[PDB]
Design a protein around this ligand. Sequence first.
Ligand SMILES: *[C@@H]1O[C@H](CO)[C@@H](O)[C@H](O)[C@H]1NC(C)=O
Ligand SMILES: *[C@@H]1O[C@H](CO)[C@@H](O)[C@H](O)[C@H]1NC(C)=O
Lengths: 116, 50, 235, 663
Amino acid sequence: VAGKPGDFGYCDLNYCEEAVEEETGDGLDEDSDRAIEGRTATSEYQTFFNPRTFGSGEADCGLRPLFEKKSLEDKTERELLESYIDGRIVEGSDAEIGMSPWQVMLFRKSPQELLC
Amino acid sequence: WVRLHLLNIGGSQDIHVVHFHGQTLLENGNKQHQLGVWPLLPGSFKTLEM
Amino acid sequence: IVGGQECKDGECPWQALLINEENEGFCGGTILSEFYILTAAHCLYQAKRFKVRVGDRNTEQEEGGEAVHEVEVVIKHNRFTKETYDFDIAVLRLKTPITFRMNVAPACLPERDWAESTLMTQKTGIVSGFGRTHEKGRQSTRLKMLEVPYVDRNSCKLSSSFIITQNMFCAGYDTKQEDACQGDAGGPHVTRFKDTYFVTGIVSWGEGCARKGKYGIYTKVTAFLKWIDRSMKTR
Amino acid sequence: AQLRQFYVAAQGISWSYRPEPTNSSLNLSVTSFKKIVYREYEPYFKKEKPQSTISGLLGPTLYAEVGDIIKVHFKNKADKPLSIHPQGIRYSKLSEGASYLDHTFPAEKMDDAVAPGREYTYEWSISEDSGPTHDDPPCLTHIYYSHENLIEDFNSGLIGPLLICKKGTLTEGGTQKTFDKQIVLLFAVFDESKSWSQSSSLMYTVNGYVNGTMPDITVCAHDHISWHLLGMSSGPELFSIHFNGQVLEQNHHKVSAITLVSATSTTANMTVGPEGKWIISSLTPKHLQAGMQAYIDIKNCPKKTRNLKKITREQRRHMKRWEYFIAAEEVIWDYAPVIPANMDKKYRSQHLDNFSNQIGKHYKKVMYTQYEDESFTKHTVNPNMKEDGILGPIIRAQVRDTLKIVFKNMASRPYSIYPHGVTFSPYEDEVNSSFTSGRNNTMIRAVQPGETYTYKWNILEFDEPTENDAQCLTRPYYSDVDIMRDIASGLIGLLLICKSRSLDRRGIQRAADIEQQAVFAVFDENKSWYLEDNINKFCENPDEVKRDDPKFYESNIMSTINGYVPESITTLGFCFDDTVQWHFCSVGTQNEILTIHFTGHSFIYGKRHEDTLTLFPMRGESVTVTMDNVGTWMLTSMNSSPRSKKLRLKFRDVKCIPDDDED
Ligand SMILES: *[C@@H]1O[C@H](CO)[C@@H](O)[C@H](O)[C@H]1NC(C)=O
Ligand SMILES: *[C@@H]1O[C@H](CO)[C@@H](O)[C@H](O)[C@H]1NC(C)=O
């Protein structure tokens, strides 16, 4: 659209609706039995952007510099999945500092508040 | 309506398809089907409604 | 405590609030003696520093009987493994002596043979604690209690994607939203017998809180009554 | 609601029981002729309506939806004053058709015996009560029978199919609109002794044809068959037909083998498989003496528009190649483990050529010896199969799973497995691997001594286990080179058709005890395939077969329990709070249903609790037990016939002695 070169606008049109849960594995092929809590994972990430076009910070997402760069199983709130003995009653009772490193909280020049 | 409690007791395969002259049974269970007769299976206890 | 209602003052005396560094209960506590508190051994992975504020009735405000007690040392099971879902039990010896008063009275061990023949053979069981008032509802501000019934072994096995060991037993409702939840971490679940409540176990894990087809994965207290006593005398 | 003017006439037919006179022509058959069977006629009895060749002795199929009124004109063309009596229809006494001391009027008695050559319009208004209900297949099966002589009329004929279907599903022709085809199945033990003419006819009859001489049946692929299985005979006769290659639905229950008795009428479903003729026969020993060979041709018809719905997953979740190397190997064996003859066969011979007490019975069976090495030399499968006899290793076959079988024959005879109740699934498809299938697409190489070949077994998403069933359904397997003598030999095995979720080939749900097998099978060593070497060369008797005997026809026959005789089996023992998930197999030629019983302890049957379970031949039974009474208790049988009387296992119950928890 007009204004900034590359600014994007959406033509007014309708769209369909889909469901996902109704499908089992398909070409997935991971396991034969069932297990919901207690799993550990380590691997890399595949990008979708040209590295020259995004620079630093592309293939490092989905992790945390403190908790996941060391690839260590972390404290109570994330323990709900990983603890085998625990799946419903963990209740760390607190959310300490920095539990959401990728969340933004806006202010306006209006009295301090978040619009969106 | 009358409930059935016909029973069979082991022995030697003494099965009996109890004919009813103009009568239709009713299975009493999670499915509740309808029957005409029933083979009296030894070692089994059968309950129905009539 | 999905749904449920508040423990009346004194109705849940052994029930304790394990206050952590911020003095908000990270786990459900259980008074055992003048110096001991009971919690599931999963509570050991959730602690910076922690105390036991016995007699607490409301997380909003102090409303009588709140005495702060400090855990001397934890008796963790040496076979306690998360994968086994078993031995999820941590006896908490206290530095501060527990003062038996209003809302302070423990639950002691019956005869092992009689407990096996009577406790796990009961019909329903009562669970209490400052738990999540719903499956995900907010934590119970008041000390809320709830009663849940026993579940057959095969029903628990089919209702669980995991092992249902020789000890662990399901207790709750098939689809009704009422059971222990977040807030009952080691939350004392008991069972009435002639007004003497008996702790028949505590949830360890499970899919959601009183979900459809799901139940609290309790621990057979009668299974480790000998170990419960030997940890009473341990540390 | 439609007014059904039916015109049927009884008439004696010189029935041949042959599918056709053949090039030899003529009719020189059993002396069962002039068989009065009623046949449908054109309106006003213009002429008899044509009857299907398959329905040789089978009479007019009478489908009827609810609300109808059936003006069944019955011209008794048979020269005997006769009658026709329904079974499960709330009729009126005027068309009662049954003569007894009802103290009724002659007008209500003329139906009970209609004069020969006389039309009687047997009218009955159908009702919604007389029809399929909820949870009931679209059609129901019944019978109208000649009440004139319930003993002699049957053997003289007078048989006709009775079907009642729901409105809508029923067509004008009687088929189900949801069903591509409908099939009616009948068996009989027709005896000329109790007939119009008299003869000693032990000859058995499937439908109208004798001992396995049916004209073959062709069914196009993916054909929704609404089956109609009817088993009727004079005496108590068991019709244990296994649908080889097919699984049928009865009352929302899925089984591959349909075991029925006399006076049994049943209906079921099957969507016809891809391709290949198939044969079905009754597992009754007398039905093995006779043919009961109903050949059916499952054919991939291009003139069918094979749907190819492909509403499936077709993917490796829940899957693994699961290479079961169960190469057959000849072994020495003892029916009685007098010494602890457990832990498969490491010290094999250890024998003394004596059928009693220690090793020396030399029951030279041919085990399905499991392996995991490709060469099959090392056993490589030596599990904790304590107090276990010759038993096929358990395959925890989940739904839609896949698995590989490879046989090397370490025995003097060619051999090849028949998965009974497992062949219902699409087998390993063969175009060049037909082998000695008998033209039935049974990929049976009968692997020669030392030969090796492979099975590619994989099941589709449809399964025998169901919500109206157990988590795993019990289905055995055995050989094909000689069924009778090889079942009499050591050629039998068993796996599980598992709907299980948390198994991973390890354990159905590893929270309950999984002790499963109770096989009171009866083996005659004077019937075994290795009769010769076993009985003659390695016993305390000369080299005669010794069929004739004081008791050697009886000595060499034995109702062992899972390869072990009842008298020399140690007592069981478990601790409390346990549930034992069982998967039984009543396979032996019992000839009499047996009723096991647990003292104090009780069974489970879906929701029902049995505490006394009857058993039926060649059928798998998979349930659990809530073992809830301390001490030793009996796995006793309530039939307790002296033939298989000493069947009681002293399973113990104690409060789990191990205190564990270290200190
Ligand atoms: C036909 O088979 C399908 C397989 O799922 C089943 O749903 C249906 O009940 C069958 N029909 C009858 C009449 O049993
Ligand atoms: C023919 O029927 C008779 C009836 O007794 C039976 O003995 C015989 O084995 C049958 N033959 C075949 C080939 O089925």
